[PDB]
Amino acid sequence: VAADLKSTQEAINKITKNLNSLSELEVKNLQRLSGAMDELHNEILELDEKVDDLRADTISSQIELAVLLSNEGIINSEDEHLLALERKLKKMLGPSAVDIGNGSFETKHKCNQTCLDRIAAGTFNAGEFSLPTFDSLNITAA
Amino acid sequence: VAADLKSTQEAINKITKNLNSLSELEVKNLQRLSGAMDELHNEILELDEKVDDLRADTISSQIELAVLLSNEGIINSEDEHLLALERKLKKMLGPSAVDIGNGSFETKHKCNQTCLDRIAAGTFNAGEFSLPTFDSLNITAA
């Protein structure tokens, strides 16, 4: 038995439409994954900045304690070791602008809001992904 | 020449089955990528916690050295600068519960096991992804 023309035509039309449908749904899945990837990326950059600023915090304050100690004038025997330590600390300062040691001073800061908002308590969409399955058309004989 | 009905029917059935097969394999690929995404996410959260706890460690101990210094009574000229430094340090404490400065004290801690296990020496599945390709059926004339 032969196959009806129109029938077969509509069948193949349905398969092509199924293919395009699956294709566009697939690009949507890719774009969702992509969005999540970008989120991860932002969280990482912000965490890095957080680490920089912690470096600046702790090293800055250690420097201030060292300077204060010099100024008091009670480090006599170990004064050279103190100077050297101050040198090391300045050498360990965060990758940013920071004011002189002598006395007190501010330091680096580069990460706000999402820095503390992206990673700390941030709802992360999991991975429920689906794609359609399709039925075949019954091509009827002419 | 016309096309055999049954033949064409089985052909289209095979194409639809190929399409569903590819579809379900594709969702599996998406779910694997998704799993890896979640892993990255966990590693990031744990690293963040690690940074918090380091902040608490270093700032806590700097505070203790400052308090000890006050208690010794040898900071006379720079005593106000010392108080101020203690204020700054308390202001820099990690985002968590920490006991009074005077004397010694504990501090923040929020990240165990995988915190040191997820990122430090953790086998990360790479990206070997594949999908099937399919053959066309020879539709035989009636």
Added chain:
Amino acid sequence: VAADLKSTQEAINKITKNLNSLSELEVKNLQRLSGAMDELHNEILELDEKVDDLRADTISSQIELAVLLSNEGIINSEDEHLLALERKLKKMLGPSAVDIGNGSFETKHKCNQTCLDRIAAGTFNAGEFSLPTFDSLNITAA
């Protein structure tokens, strides 16, 4: 009306070819996403190492200030508290090899180049993903 054999054959051939095309394009999309995933992973490992080395930096220098303070001999009343603090600090040292406290000393370091190059100013490919859509063939009657 019946459907021409050859015509239908070429139609189904085109649909199968469309399916294989979409399939291979899809694996390419997966491999691109996978590459980006690996990048994120590397950035994370490097950030972790960065955190380790900051720990070593700050804790090492706090230890040195404590030792210097002992050596000066001006911590008399609080000398036990100082010893204890040194113990705590050594207990907080980074997960790596570090030389004795007394005097000065070096410490942990495990992350170079990309450690400061991967996350700090690194162009991250976004998510422009596409897949083809296909046309259906007009099967002509015999």
